[PDB]
Amino acid sequence: ALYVLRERIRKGLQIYQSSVQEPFLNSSNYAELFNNDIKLFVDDTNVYRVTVHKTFEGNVATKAING
RNA sequence: ACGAAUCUCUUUGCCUUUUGGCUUAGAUCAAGUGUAGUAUCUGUUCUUU
Numbered sequence: 001a002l003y004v005l006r007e008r009i010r011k012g013l014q015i016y017q018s019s020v021q022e023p024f025l026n027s028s029n030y031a032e033l034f035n036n037d038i039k040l041f042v043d044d045t046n047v048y049r050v051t052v053h054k055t056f057e058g059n060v061a062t063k064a065i066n067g
Numbered sequence: 068a069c070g071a072a073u074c075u076c077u078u079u080g081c082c083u084u085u086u087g088g089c090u091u092a093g094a095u096c097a098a099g100u101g102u103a104g105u106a107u108c109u110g111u112u113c114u115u116u
Contacts, residue, residue: 050103051103051104052102052103052104052105053104053105054104054105058105058106060103060104060105
């Protein structure tokens with residue numbers, strides 16, 4: 001929590017040193033994604049989907065769909 | 068032919084849906100995309116009129 005806080009403040013001051021301990025999932029480390037180790041994977045892309053429909057005024061009105 | 072009434076048009080008269088403020092003209096004139104919608108395009112074919 002405290003690290004998050006410091007990082008938050010750091011972001012607030014645009015001084016964020018881009019330094020990570022664990023490297024990202026690139027195409028090479030893709031192999032070592034999984035390794036007899038319990039994992040989970042998350043995507044939030046289709047949480048907020050929208051029906052674009054016209055209005056009386058003529059402009060667009062976005063309405064939420066199930067996601 | 069004169070008088071009158073009815074109708075149509077033309078000339079004029081009437082403006083009869085006929086401009087309802089002020090400021091520094093009140094101020095400033097852009098660099099966008101994909102996705103969707105909407106309208107508008109244009110072609111495109113065929114049908115029968």
